[PDB]
From Swiss-Prot, chain A:
Belongs to the WD repeat SEC13 family. The GATOR2 complex is negatively regulated by the upstream amino acid sensors CASTOR1 and SESN2, which sequester the GATOR2 complex in absence of amino acids. In the presence of abundant amino acids, GATOR2 is released from CASTOR1 and SESN2 and activated. It comes from the Eukaryota. Keywords: Cell cycle, Cell division, Centromere, Chromosome, Chromosome partition, Isopeptide bond, Kinetochore, Lysosome, Membrane, Mitosis, mRNA transport, Nuclear pore complex, Nucleus, Phosphoprotein, Protein transport, Repeat, Translocation, Transport, Ubl conjugation, WD repeat. This is Nucleoporin SEH1. InterPro entries: G-protein_beta_WD-40_rep (IPR020472), Sec13/Seh1_fam (IPR037363), WD40/YVTN_repeat-like_dom_sf (IPR015943), WD40_repeat_dom_sf (IPR036322), WD40_rpt (IPR001680). WD repeats lie at residues 10-49, 55-89, 100-141, 149-199, 206-243, 257-296. The keyword Nucleotidyltransferase does not apply. One of its GO terms (cellular component) is lysosomal membrane. There is a cross-link at K12 (Glycyl lysine isopeptide (Lys-Gly) (interchain with G-Cter in SUMO2)).
Swiss-Prot record, chain B:
Zn(2+) 2 binds at C65, C68, H87, H90. Component of the GATOR2 subcomplex, composed of MIOS, SEC13, SEH1L, WDR24 and WDR59. The GATOR2 complex interacts with CASTOR1 and CASTOR2; the interaction is negatively regulated by arginine. The GATOR2 complex interacts with SESN1, SESN2 and SESN3; the interaction is negatively regulated by amino acids. SESN1, SESN2 and SESN3 convey leucine availability via direct interaction with SEH1L and WDR24. It is found in: Lysosome membrane. Zn(2+) 4 binds at H84, C101, C105. A zinc finger (RING-type) spans 63-112. The gene is WDR24. This is GATOR2 complex protein WDR24. Belongs to the WD repeat WDR24 family. Catalytic component of the GATOR2 complex, a multiprotein complex that acts as an activator of the amino acid-sensing branch of the mTORC1 signaling pathway. The GATOR2 complex indirectly activates mTORC1 through the inhibition of the GATOR1 subcomplex. GATOR2 probably acts as an E3 ubiquitin-protein ligase toward GATOR1. In the presence of abundant amino acids, the GATOR2 complex mediates ubiquitination of the NPRL2 core component of the GATOR1 complex, leading to GATOR1 inactivation. In the absence of amino acids, GATOR2 is inhibited, activating the GATOR1 complex. It comes from Homo sapiens. A zinc finger (C4-type) spans 40-62. Autoubiquitinated; MIOS is required to prevent autoubiquitination. Zn(2+) 1 binds at C41, C44, C55, C58.
From Swiss-Prot, chain C:
As a component of the GATOR2 complex, functions as an activator of the amino acid-sensing branch of the mTORC1 signaling pathway. The GATOR2 complex indirectly activates mTORC1 through the inhibition of the GATOR1 subcomplex. GATOR2 probably acts as an E3 ubiquitin-protein ligase toward GATOR1. In the presence of abundant amino acids, the GATOR2 complex mediates ubiquitination of the NPRL2 core component of the GATOR1 complex, leading to GATOR1 inactivation. In the absence of amino acids, GATOR2 is inhibited, activating the GATOR1 complex. Component of the GATOR2 subcomplex, composed of MIOS, SEC13, SEH1L, WDR24 and WDR59. The GATOR2 complex interacts with CASTOR1 and CASTOR2; the interaction is negatively regulated by arginine. CASTOR1 and CASTOR2 convey leucine availability via direct interaction with MIOS. The GATOR2 complex interacts with SESN1, SESN2 and SESN3; the interaction is negatively regulated by amino acids. The gene is MIOS. Belongs to the WD repeat mio family. It is found in: Lysosome membrane. This is GATOR2 complex protein MIOS. Zn(2+) 1 binds at C56, C59, C70, C73.
Amino acid sequence: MFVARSIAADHKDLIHDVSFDFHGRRMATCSSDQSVKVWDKSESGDWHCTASWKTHSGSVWRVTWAHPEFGQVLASCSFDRTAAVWEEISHWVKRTTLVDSRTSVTDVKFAPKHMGLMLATCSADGIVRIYEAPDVMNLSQWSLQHEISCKLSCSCISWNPSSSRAHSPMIAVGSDDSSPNAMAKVQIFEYNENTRKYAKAETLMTVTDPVHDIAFAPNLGRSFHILAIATKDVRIFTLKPVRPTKFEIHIVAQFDNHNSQVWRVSWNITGTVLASSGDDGCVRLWKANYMDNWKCTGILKG
Amino acid sequence: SYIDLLQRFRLWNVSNEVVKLSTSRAVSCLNQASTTLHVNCSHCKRPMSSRGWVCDRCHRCASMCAVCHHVVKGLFVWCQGCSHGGHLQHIMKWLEGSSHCPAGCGHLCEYS
Amino acid sequence: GSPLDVLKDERVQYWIENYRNLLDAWRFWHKRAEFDIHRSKLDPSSKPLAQVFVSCNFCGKSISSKVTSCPGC
Ligand SMILES: [Zn+2]
Ligand SMILES: [Zn+2]
Ligand SMILES: [Zn+2]
Ligand SMILES: [Zn+2]
Ligand SMILES: [Zn+2]
């Protein structure tokens, strides 16, 4: 039920990551030669360009957007042990740098809007840092708030998008160390209001192979959570709280339709279709059937 | 004399352009007699600063479009009966086709 | 028609907010305005959006009997 098309865009070098905005009208593509671009769209249905600049001293890995109720903020992280914040004055300018790392930075993500304007950043040394902006007037003033150690090399992070009044803020981080020894790879933390700190919640001991990406699912008023893991086989979990908070953990998907290593995972707006891009050059979409069973619903070739 | 004649014929867009450019001090200062407003925040009932759009106590965007739900940095149309409003043209377009307040408070904001 | 005892659940009021956010994502703004007009009538326990308001310069007390005169001053 899914078709393909080719978008009319020209790029000089290989692309590394692509992200969208809230409404789905803008775009940002980090490239190989340390250049990022903005791709705006018109009523007719075509993409034009608006900006292009060089940012870091090394390869740029991931870029992401921020909620419109704060501005037109972006975020990028590179191998040069830095992560920068941009804005829009029709020329983007730099407003802050995060130099407090001592090794390559691999991921940067924006916290949900319902808790202010915060930022999460993990390094290869095995540490995550939670930043914040006390005022939404000055984007040059940031403060380090929390510090979490994982004791393992970090590869991916993800926030919990739930915005209920009975769900504490929680984060998840995965590892990719290829050691012969068997150890847990995915960890989950949560923030305790009474003591104001982040504590370990659960460790998915069922996973020992390296993990390359992790993504949560928009809650949309559900009674549990959904998580997806990107490893030698795509896995889908289900974390449900039992009245740190105890959780019940299950498995509902162990697809092997790649014969390779999956590399990226991303959900849609409602939280019912999944996208997986592997090492065979094809993108496959999955979706739950009419009997709460996950069955593949389309193969797309590059 | 020129300004009075212009105001008789109801041409404000030129009358005020004369005041903006006129070389006399009194006529230039004639533009700034009680032409500044004071706006506070309805959640906390405290006056706001001069160059900001966020409340310093509640820490929430007090100037939100009732229609487009974005931040209003520029012009802000306001209603004196229910204290709801937003962007100029958004509200003007909305009221053309309906007679209810966009915020949804049961107020006929034009007396029908 | 449901009574005010059912609408006060913290689970019924999450679905409505999620629906409103979904509508705003697609920029169906007038549809959301109509939905809000319908909802504010179907239940009286909700609260319309809280915004700015103007004040009398000398009085201070919330202008909101000469029509160009402060209500209290
Ligand atoms: Zn306030
Ligand atoms: Zn608007
Ligand atoms: Zn109103
Ligand atoms: Zn009104
Ligand atoms: Zn007064």
